[PDB]
Ligand binder design. Sequence first.
Ligand SMILES: *[C@@H]1O[C@H](CO)[C@@H](O[C@@H]2O[C@H](CO)[C@@H](O)[C@H](O)[C@H]2NC(C)=O)[C@H](O)[C@H]1NC(C)=O
Ligand SMILES: *[C@@H]1O[C@H](CO)[C@@H](O)[C@H](O)[C@H]1NC(C)=O
Ligand SMILES: NC(=[NH2+])NCCC[C@H](N)C(=O)O
Ligand SMILES: [Cl-]
Ligand SMILES: [Cl-]
Ligand SMILES: [Cl-]
Ligand SMILES: [Cl-]
Length: 701
Amino acid sequence: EAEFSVSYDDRAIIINGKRKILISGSIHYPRSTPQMWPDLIQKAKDGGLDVIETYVFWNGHEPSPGKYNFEGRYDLVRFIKMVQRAGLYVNLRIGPYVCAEWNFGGFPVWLKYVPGMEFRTNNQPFKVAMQGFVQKIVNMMKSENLFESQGGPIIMAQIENEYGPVEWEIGAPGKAYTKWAAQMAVGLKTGVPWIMCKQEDAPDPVIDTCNGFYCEGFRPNKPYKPKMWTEVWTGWYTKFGGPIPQRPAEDIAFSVARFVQNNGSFFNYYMYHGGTNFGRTSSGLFIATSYDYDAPLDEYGLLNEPKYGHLRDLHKAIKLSEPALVSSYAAVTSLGSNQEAHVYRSKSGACAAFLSNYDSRYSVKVTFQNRPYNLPPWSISILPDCKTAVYNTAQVNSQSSSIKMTPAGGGLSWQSYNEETPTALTANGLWEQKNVTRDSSDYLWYMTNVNIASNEGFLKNGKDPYLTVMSAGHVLHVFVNGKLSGTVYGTLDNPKLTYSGNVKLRAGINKISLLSVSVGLPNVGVHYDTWNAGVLGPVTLSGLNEGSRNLAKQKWSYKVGLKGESLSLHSLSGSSSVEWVRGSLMAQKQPLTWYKATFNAPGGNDPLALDMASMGKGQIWINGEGVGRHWPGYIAQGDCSKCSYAGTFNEKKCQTNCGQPSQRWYHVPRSWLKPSGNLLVVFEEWGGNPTGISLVRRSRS
Ligand SMILES: *[C@@H]1O[C@H](CO)[C@@H](O[C@@H]2O[C@H](CO)[C@@H](O)[C@H](O)[C@H]2NC(C)=O)[C@H](O)[C@H]1NC(C)=O
Ligand SMILES: *[C@@H]1O[C@H](CO)[C@@H](O)[C@H](O)[C@H]1NC(C)=O
Ligand SMILES: NC(=[NH2+])NCCC[C@H](N)C(=O)O
Ligand SMILES: [Cl-]
Ligand SMILES: [Cl-]
Ligand SMILES: [Cl-]
Ligand SMILES: [Cl-]
């Protein structure tokens, strides 16, 4: 007989023979640093979590076919072992489609270009690659007994991610792929359950699970499977150009209690720590570098009060109730028009009760077992012994905290290095951007010649012809004869672009150079991997004798990435290899400019950020390591109004920061610094003043 095991029944996941009501939170290992992990995990433990949930990030682990990375913050095994050291379990969401507001949904970009490839359907090249990667991860975990069946922390794993809605659209090949994925995963023999989220048709023995702001009405697809909520959304993601979304602690607590009172036995906060999209292969399409998510642990790892403590107290109440929860089922008694008691009374006498008020506007005082309980609107009281309420989801006993970002160390000494604008790797017509760059850089130059006859009407009348450039996105800079004519940029929902303007041209050869920029790759949507980036046109020049010229129907030239990228200006060795501009000649408010400075690490233990308010858009490195994209120049658009915790939440309900830079502060991990001589390199795409950049220390108070 196995010493350790995981099974399940209609009531719960069963660990080493005992039913458990499992409290879980998401922490994505590459969204923080190995130095942070033990602290984050400890905070989760102290916050009442039994489980840490994480995706596996394929694109990070396999940057080219058969070449793997498990180093640094991609050391998945190290992360899993740290969770185990804290006495927590793991839900390993392998995918390898993970969505996750993460570049290309987790797929390596090279995968797209394998002959005969089609993503997320019953496609042979896809299935071979997917099976190979999932098998590799499973075998890595098994090699060190990391599944609970072997004494390790992993108690379940997920195959795919929210595939149900994809099948709905693509039909039978989707049904066939689902069946294949489930049987393939189960056949890897992990010794523990497999799950699929948002997958009503998940075949036995896979447990299908629920995601959302609320999941109280969800039931799995067989009565002998437990009821599990894989993503309790704790807020929403921040997009560049969007506001900062919040979700009230009282509403999260209500949603969790609503699920647990209805036989729910596993729930996981997405995110518990959200963290940061470091570098340039992390963020999904238009996703901000901050992945804060209004999580119980903020981007920097600090306690987000009062949410952290309010959920901590909810968890204590659930723990007090657990012996009753696992030895009975929820029995409903009506209390009033929109009020109920869900009671868990065991054969032995243990009793826990949940008293609910679903009215979003009014308080109701109910009588339960001869005692009065007042229930604020949209709240649930928990009585772990059916006698005394120890917690109510709308009564927050934790003190709130606000953010302070305090400058530290003052201003730095800057040097600059200019990018050049290249001019007319060629083609007759326009190529899609991912195809050309393979996502090796955000930047692709599209270049062409425009010949102008001496007899053009506009030349003799002193007017300018009219240029229209249409692009699939995501940012476009239009240069005409070496001069920037305009910049256009999209939104997450609409990344496509149109530049249109009068442009000055002369007799003979004119140069048009387009700098096309991606800002993370799409990560969700049926066939999202087929969506274009870059300039596919139409591209037209009107106001000519001929009428309008189709500029797509001529020779185009291509240049992948920036000169500074080729030179590795982000690194100490690369930046030191060239001479930079110093002194009063420092480039100011100039597009396509690299900046560098050296700084000493601030003392103490407060988390750190760069204040980038004086800058525009680009990328940041510290000691050669990518801090992430900056885009303070993208002002937050949306509706920001007072919200109440009460009533059905949606991601736009409690938005803040409207009309302000969508992200101003950029997280710098402490462990990336040395005491002295830290190299800071900023590529500035749009234009800024580097003198305004400072380090800040973050505190909560
Ligand atoms: C918790 O689960 C129990 C047991 O499945 C549910 O009670 C059963 O409900 C089904 C209908 O779905 C009935 O056919 C059974 O007769 C019920 N059994 C018992 C012992 O009452 C119960 O509905 C669930 N609780 C809630 C509130 O969802
Ligand atoms: C992709 O680039 C190749 C050259 O490698 C070219 O043959 C093809 O037409 C391009 N397709 C698109 C859609 O850009
Ligand atoms: N307010 C609600 N309970 N809405 C229904 C939630 C649906 C749930 N998230 C699901 O996907 O099945
Ligand atoms: Cl996760
Ligand atoms: Cl790292
Ligand atoms: Cl097994
Ligand atoms: Cl760190």
